[PDB]
Design a protein around this nucleic acid. Sequence first.
DNA 1: ATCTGACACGTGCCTGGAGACTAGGGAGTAATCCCCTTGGGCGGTTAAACGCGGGGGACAGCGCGTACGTGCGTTTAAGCGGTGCTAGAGCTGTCTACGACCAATTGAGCGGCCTCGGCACCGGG
DNA 2: CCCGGTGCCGAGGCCGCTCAATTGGTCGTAGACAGCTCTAGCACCGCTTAAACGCACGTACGCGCTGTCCCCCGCGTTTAACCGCCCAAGGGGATTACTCCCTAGTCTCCAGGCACGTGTCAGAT
Lengths: 94, 85, 443, 77, 88, 93, 88, 92, 89
Amino acid sequence: FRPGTVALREIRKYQKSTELLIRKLPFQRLVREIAQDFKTDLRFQSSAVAALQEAAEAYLVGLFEDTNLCAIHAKRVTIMPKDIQLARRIRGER
Amino acid sequence: EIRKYQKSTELLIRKLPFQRLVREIAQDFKTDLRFQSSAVAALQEAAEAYLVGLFEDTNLCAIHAKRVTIMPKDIQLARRIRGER
Amino acid sequence: KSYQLKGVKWLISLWQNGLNGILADQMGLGKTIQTIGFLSHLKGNGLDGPYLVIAPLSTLSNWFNEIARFTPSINAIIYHGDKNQRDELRRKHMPKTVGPKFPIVITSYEVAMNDAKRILRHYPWKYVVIDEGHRLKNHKCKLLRELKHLKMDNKLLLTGTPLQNNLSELWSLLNFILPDIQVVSKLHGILRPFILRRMKCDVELSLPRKKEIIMYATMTDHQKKFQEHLVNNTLEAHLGENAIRGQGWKGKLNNLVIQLRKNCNHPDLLQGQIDGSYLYPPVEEIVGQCGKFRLLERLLVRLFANNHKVLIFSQWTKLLDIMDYYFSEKGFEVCRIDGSVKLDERRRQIKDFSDEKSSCSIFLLSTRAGGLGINLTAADTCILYDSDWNPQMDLQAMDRCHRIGQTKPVHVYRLSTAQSIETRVLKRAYSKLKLEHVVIGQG
Amino acid sequence: NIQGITKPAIRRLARRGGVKRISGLIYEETRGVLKIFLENVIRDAVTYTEHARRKTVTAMDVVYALKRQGRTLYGFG
Amino acid sequence: GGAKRHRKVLRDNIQGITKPAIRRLARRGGVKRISGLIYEETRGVLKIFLENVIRDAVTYTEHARRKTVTAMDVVYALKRQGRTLYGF
Amino acid sequence: RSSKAGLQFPVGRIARFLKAGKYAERVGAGAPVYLAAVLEYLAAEVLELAGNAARDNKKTRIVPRHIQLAVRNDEELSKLLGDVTIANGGVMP
Amino acid sequence: KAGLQFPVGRIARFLKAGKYAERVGAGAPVYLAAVLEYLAAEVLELAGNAARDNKKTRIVPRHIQLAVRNDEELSKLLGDVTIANGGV
Amino acid sequence: SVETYKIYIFKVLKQVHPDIGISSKAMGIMNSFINDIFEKLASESSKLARYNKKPTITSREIQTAVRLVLPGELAKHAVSEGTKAVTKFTSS
Amino acid sequence: TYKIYIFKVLKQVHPDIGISSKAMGIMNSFINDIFEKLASESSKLARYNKKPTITSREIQTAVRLVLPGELAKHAVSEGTKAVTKFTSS
DNA sequence: ATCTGACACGTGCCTGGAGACTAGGGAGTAATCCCCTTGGGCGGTTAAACGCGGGGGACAGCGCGTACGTGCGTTTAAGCGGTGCTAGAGCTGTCTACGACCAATTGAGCGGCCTCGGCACCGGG
DNA sequence: CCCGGTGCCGAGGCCGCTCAATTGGTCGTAGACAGCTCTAGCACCGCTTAAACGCACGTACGCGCTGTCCCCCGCGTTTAACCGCCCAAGGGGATTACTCCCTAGTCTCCAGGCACGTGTCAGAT
Ligand SMILES: Nc1ncnc2c1ncn2[C@@H]1O[C@H](COP(=O)(O)OP(=O)(O)O)[C@@H](O)[C@H]1O
């Protein structure tokens, strides 16, 4: 096809689905690594990591919508790092 | 003029206009009501602070689009990614 | 083949009373003819019936080839793979109509388990035959749950090692073979009717005998220091004092047994895992820092005095790696096949190791790997650098080199360390061999 | 009474924030965003007041409302 | 061949979030084209979020004398941060 | 008591919770009734909107995807769940 | 009482009043006093230091604001404070 | 062993939409939404009690707490549903 | 209220400075607000664990869950020292 | 140099400190048993890595014109000061009608057990 | 994009039983409310002067248009790692239900601090 038409295909299917992205095993490795720092030998139930993953994905999707707004404000379509850095500054996040 | 008001701690709106607005917008919630002369002061301090922040984020939003003149699109982009409305 | 004729006499009998049997003839008799001989014997009355035979993959090639060779013709088909299995499903023959061409159905444990739905529809299966009974030694295994959905009017189990771990594996199987099902004699009353284990006794003196000897080693000072720091704690500090490349590391929640077994194997495993140690112990002498390593080295120098090729086994793959590092520094040429290496890659390595001219005498070889049916005979000596916690793995590994084609007499060197969990494990594996040895008494 | 927030004042506030040059349609927008804010805080204040059987918006009513909305206000009471 | 000094190192756990997965999360947010320096930026903002939540969960746990972070410890951390999760 | 009023939610169970939740020393008699009557109203609204959602997708049962959608659609119920993240609920086009 | 300047007794009383819970331990009043004291000390230090820059011999609302704004921790605890009679 | 409003959330549904099923993991959200709205209101009304220095959470308090949590027109129609009920309970 | 103590803390840290009247107000407000936050958190923590006592442990978790960052890591040390001195003596 | 603040001080009355009970939740222990590490086996199979065009979009430069800032002279109307008036905030004292509590009573709703219709996955279209 | 037809499994169903919600007297206390004092909020006047307003004028910035070239996307092919199911044995770790003792609230007396009322003083306004 012509570049950009299969991309609008993907922004429709995924907005309609409710199936989670991010493989389950890598996220669970990351959380644990981030944890050993706080309490040595802390164990996570499975439901906990599940919840954490759900929340994270939502956070990132929201950030991604506001970083698209910011980019459009500058008369572009490509979202660049500056946009994220602008979005977070307006939301207060560290 | 940027430098001057960045060193001062004085009030920037006049007094009585702020009083009237606050009395009217109350009227549409409960008829007849009084207001201690300290309440209208708190309400002014807070409002003035709020507007300064909005303006500081709108300036950021304009520097993004490579301008230096502020425009109504900016206030709106600020207030939307703030969550205000 | 008199025994195998008594092997077909007893499965024609089982067919008669209706009961259900677990032929347990020893490994080496063939383990292949007996099974197809019974399938071909059912030609009387009609071989044209539902028939199913689940087994690993390699078993399948051999089975098919034999059905082709010992007997002239038996509609046979290997239902291996997925999606490509859908076409041969119908190309084979009619759906349920069992003509004299309804081809024998040969599947694998995955296929059987993953898509039982397809085969669930078929008629009460005349005889489902499961090659390796040990697969079902757990009564909560998902294969067992999916294996009950099949409507089976008869069952059969092939094995050579009925019990390995304890009696509960005998219990779970007995539910499978017979749902209905001093004291030693009382057990032999229940089991005499079904079990038919013909030892390697009718055929004996087949190969030169072997010697299995345990040569202990004395835990060195440094390992003792590590062990005491593990019996209490601080082994995550005596190695974490440097605090570089990885800080606030996890606790060795490792069951004491296996964190102290890892020590008794080689302390580097802990040190590497603890500190950054971007580089291996380059001392190439610190590797000496393990007593069991030093006893291996001297043994090997005395066994190069003759050059007869050795075999090395281990439980993990980090430890074989340390060994390889050590020897490769000195310069020895090594070949290695663990589970990480690929299949066709490992098959050519053997084809080269099997090359007598080539001087890659050393051969690193993990324990649980190798599947079944490899042919390693160019070597003569096996060194079990670790223990098992299940002696039937040790017997298999020893037999892999103790198989046909070994003219030179074989030794076995089960290394170990005194005053530690290695000696504990040896006692455990010994009592498991004894659990199976008194069972061999029944016959 | 919202035209009493006159053009020079908005400009002064804007130079506190950092703005450099003001457009000309910026004023009506400012006058709207002030009104919304003032309308929320005052509603909450009048609620708190009535709850105490009074007729006088008073000390700690406004402060409490402003806190309620993420804006702690020290002093003024 | 026996590796020399080099042992058997492994890839970091953050690099586990593959570029394909960031793209999929972006397209669900409505984005059209994505730059290339975006990926190394998303990773940091994920890390910060997670670090604030896990810290609160590990606190709420210890107070119960326990050593396992349940799902109710996570739900409380999120509620302290403004995000409320229904369904656990 | 639930019966004396037209409420369908349980007045007694709410009263007990309020009294046993250390919310205050002495709960009155009307407080359990009022709370029940507000909670019932709120639920009815959400459920009524979610139900209108499903028929559209041509299904006769509600799933989290429906409640999310309904909430996102309406303004007031959104100002209320301004941060809530329903599980397995997707996002609005 | 025994160790600090703040009124361990009064803090305890305030905990008894307000009905924060049924029973208050013995250490609970003591700990809170110390934390509040530390927090006040930090703020009073930066402000005076702020006043040591302006050279003003008297701490005024402006200094407190400036100090809170600068330091990276207090700016986080004190997120949106609007000190009365202060400025940016 | 686990108290829940599931029984009552399915009675209101029937009353509003007569012929529609509910499904599971779907009333796992509706129950949570009720528990949370209860909590908020009660806590507000306690703070509203401790503030007004009274030891009793009465109806007046629950009402001023509703007016401050439930946002917008919901309030009005909730307040009504609720008051209606208190007068009704009164003449029993 | 806390005037004397805030006047005392100042004399110790900056021996020669004074403080205006509006400043004292801000300071007292700050102290009171921290107090309230800390205590409310502690009460909630208690309730979630079905406990009728607000012990020290809850004063510490509360300080960790609300004081942001290293600012807390110190406050915890300061409080532990003072409860230890009081208990031993 | 002075006036808007800023600094002593007092009484007293009101609240912290101390001494003690009966109470009574919390620290201690034993138990059962069930989900949770760490290191390896084999077989699936779908997602992720890589390489290569090619085209679209980011970016820089240039030019016109229009809307913003500055300046100066009118004209509002805010700020201050002072006077008068009364609504209503704040507090006190009486007296009950309302909530806690206990006990007797028992039907509503709750854990585990039925079944069958609607709704996901396909190949076929 | 329709279309059957498929199963085929969870959405409704029922059912004793336990405990939790009613209903009735005392039971005391928490509530309303009636009345009085006096603060402070509102209305209005007159005068000064500072901030707002209107209009003219110049020019800096915003926006459209153009051209170059970087780098992102889509596709095909090869890689890889998530995902499943299995070892054995450890051995732990939570939840529940077990039990005794030392501290909470409770009194009760009695100490001596902090709150509203006053004199000083000194800065920076
Ligand atoms: N002890 C024995 N006596 C006689 N024949 C034997 C014996 N052991 C094995 N065999 C031979 O084994 C053959 C069947 O096994 P086959 O499938 O050919 O090979 P494998 O033994 O490798 O499985 C028979 O033809 C039989 O002659």
